[PDB]
Coordinates of C-alpha atoms and ligand atoms in Angstrom, one line a residue:
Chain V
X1020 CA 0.0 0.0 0.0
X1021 CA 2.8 2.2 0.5
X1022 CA 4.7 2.2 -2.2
X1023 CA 1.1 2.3 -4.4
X1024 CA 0.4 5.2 -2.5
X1025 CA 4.0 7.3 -2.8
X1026 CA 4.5 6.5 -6.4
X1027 CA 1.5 8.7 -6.7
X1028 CA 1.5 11.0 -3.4
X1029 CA 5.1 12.0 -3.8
X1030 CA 5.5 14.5 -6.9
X1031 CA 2.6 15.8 -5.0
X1032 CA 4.1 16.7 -1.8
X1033 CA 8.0 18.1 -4.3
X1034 CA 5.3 20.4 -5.6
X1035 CA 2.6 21.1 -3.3
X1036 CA 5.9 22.3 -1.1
X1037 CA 7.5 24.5 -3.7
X1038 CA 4.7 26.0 -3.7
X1039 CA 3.5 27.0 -0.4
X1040 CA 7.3 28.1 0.5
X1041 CA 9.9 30.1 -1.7
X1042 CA 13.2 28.9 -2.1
X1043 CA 15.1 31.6 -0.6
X1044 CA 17.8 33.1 -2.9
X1045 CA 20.9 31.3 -1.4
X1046 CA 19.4 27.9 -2.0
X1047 CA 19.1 28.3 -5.3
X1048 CA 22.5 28.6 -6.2
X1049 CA 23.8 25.5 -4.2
X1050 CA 21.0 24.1 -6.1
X1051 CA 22.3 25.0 -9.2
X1052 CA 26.0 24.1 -8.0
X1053 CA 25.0 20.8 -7.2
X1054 CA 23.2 19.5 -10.3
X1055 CA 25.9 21.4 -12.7
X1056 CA 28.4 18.9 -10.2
X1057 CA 26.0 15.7 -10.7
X1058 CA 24.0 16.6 -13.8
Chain J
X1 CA 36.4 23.3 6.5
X2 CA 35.8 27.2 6.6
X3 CA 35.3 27.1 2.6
X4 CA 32.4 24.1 2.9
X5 CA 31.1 25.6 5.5
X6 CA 30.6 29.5 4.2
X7 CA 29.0 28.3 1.3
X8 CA 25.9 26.0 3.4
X9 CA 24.8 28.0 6.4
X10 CA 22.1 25.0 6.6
X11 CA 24.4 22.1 7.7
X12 CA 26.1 23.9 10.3
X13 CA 23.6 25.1 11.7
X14 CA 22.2 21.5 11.9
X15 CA 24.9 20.2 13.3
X16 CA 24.8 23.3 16.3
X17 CA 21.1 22.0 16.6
X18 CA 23.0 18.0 17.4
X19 CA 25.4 19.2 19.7
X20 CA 22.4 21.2 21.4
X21 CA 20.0 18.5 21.5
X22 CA 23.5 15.8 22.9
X23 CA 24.1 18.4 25.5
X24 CA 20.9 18.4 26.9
X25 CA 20.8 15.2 27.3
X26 CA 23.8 15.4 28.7
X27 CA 22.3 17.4 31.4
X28 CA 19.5 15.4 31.8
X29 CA 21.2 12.4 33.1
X30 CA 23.9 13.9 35.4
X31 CA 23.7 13.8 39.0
X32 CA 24.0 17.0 41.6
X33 CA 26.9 17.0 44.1
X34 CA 28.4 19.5 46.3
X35 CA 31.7 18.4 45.1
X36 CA 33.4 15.4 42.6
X37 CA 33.3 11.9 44.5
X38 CA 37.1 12.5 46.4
X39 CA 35.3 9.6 48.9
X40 CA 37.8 6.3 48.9
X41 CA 36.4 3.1 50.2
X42 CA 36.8 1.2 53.5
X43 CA 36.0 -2.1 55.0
X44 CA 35.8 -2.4 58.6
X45 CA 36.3 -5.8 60.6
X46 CA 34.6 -6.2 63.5
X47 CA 35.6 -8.8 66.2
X48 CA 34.3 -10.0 69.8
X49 CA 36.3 -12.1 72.3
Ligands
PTY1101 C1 35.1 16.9 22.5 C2 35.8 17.5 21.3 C3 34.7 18.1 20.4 C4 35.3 18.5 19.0 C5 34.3 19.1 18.2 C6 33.6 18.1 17.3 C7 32.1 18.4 17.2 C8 31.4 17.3 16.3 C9 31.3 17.9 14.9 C10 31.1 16.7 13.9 C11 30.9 17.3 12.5 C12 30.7 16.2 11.5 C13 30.3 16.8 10.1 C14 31.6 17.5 9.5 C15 31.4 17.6 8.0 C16 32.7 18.2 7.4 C17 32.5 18.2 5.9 C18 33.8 18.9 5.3 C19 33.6 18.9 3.7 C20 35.0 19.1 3.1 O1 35.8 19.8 3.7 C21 35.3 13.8 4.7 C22 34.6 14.6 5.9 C23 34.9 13.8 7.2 C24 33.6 13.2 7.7 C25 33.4 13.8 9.1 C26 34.1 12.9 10.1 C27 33.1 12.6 11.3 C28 33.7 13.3 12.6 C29 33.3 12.4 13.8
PTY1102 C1 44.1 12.5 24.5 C2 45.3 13.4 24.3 C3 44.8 14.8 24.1 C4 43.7 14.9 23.1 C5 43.2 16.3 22.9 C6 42.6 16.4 21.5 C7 41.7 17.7 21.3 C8 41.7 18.0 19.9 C9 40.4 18.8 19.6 C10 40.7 19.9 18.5 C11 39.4 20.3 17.8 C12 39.6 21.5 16.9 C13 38.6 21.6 15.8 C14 39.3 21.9 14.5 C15 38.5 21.5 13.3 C16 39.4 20.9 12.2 C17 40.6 21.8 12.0 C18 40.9 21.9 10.5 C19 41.3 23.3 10.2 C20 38.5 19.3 4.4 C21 38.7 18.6 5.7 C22 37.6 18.8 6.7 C23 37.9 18.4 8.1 C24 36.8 17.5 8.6 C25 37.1 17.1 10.0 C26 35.9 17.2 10.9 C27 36.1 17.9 12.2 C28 35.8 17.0 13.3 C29 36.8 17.3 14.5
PTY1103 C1 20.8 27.8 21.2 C2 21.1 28.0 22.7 C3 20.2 27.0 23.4 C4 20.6 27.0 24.9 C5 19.5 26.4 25.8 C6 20.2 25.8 27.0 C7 19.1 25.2 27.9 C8 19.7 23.9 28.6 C9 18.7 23.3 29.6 C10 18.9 21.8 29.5 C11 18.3 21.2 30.8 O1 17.9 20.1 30.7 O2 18.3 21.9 32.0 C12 17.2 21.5 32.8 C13 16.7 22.8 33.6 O3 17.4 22.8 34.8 C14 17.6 24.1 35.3 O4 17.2 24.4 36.4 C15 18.2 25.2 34.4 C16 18.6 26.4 35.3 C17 19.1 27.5 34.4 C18 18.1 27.8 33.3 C19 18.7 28.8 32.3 C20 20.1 28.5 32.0 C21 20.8 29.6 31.3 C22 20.4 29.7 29.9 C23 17.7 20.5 33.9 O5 16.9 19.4 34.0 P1 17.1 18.4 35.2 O6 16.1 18.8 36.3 O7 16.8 17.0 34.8 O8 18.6 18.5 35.8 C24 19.0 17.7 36.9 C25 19.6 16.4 36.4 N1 19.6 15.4 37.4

């Protein structure tokens, strides 16, 4: 049940969160830094 | 160090939140004394005749 529920539930809560609170301007560069490292 | 650590505010300040949370605990489970245990241990024999 779990897992059938978070495959769905999941994106959900990444952008319901986005959302409701801003990234603040010095996470996004770390961000950026990060996946630019990892791609 | 100082380079990792100016760049992500985020994990130090999680790790001040550890230590806080360790050293409460810490105080949690210590005992109050008037002063450290200087108190050495002694056996007494007793005898009747
Ligand atoms: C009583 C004395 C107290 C001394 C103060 C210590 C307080 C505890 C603090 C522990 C902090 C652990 C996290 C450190 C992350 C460092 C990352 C550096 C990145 C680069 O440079 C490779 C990185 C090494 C991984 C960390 C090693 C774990 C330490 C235990
Ligand atoms: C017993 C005999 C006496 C023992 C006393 C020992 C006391 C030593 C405590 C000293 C703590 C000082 C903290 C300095 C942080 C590291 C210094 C590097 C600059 C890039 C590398 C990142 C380094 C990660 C290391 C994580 C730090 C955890 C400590
Ligand atoms: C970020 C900075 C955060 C700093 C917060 C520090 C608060 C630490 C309090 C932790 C704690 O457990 O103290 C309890 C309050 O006791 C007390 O009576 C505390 C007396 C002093 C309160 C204010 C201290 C100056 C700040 C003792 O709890 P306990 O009764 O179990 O201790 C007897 C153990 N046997």
């Amino acid at each position: 049940i779990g897992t059938l529920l978070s495959v769905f539930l999941v994106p959900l809560f990444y952008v319901v969160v986005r959302k409701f609170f801003k990234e603040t301007a010095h996470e996004h560069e770390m961000a950026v830094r990060h996946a630019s490292k990892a791609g | 160090m100082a380079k990792f650590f100016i760049d992500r505010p985020i994990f130090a300040w999680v790790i001040s939140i550890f230590i806080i949370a360790a050293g409460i605990f810490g105080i949690k489970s210590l005992p109050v004394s008037q002063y450290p245990s200087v108190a050495a241990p002694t056996i007494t024999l007793h005898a009747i005749y």
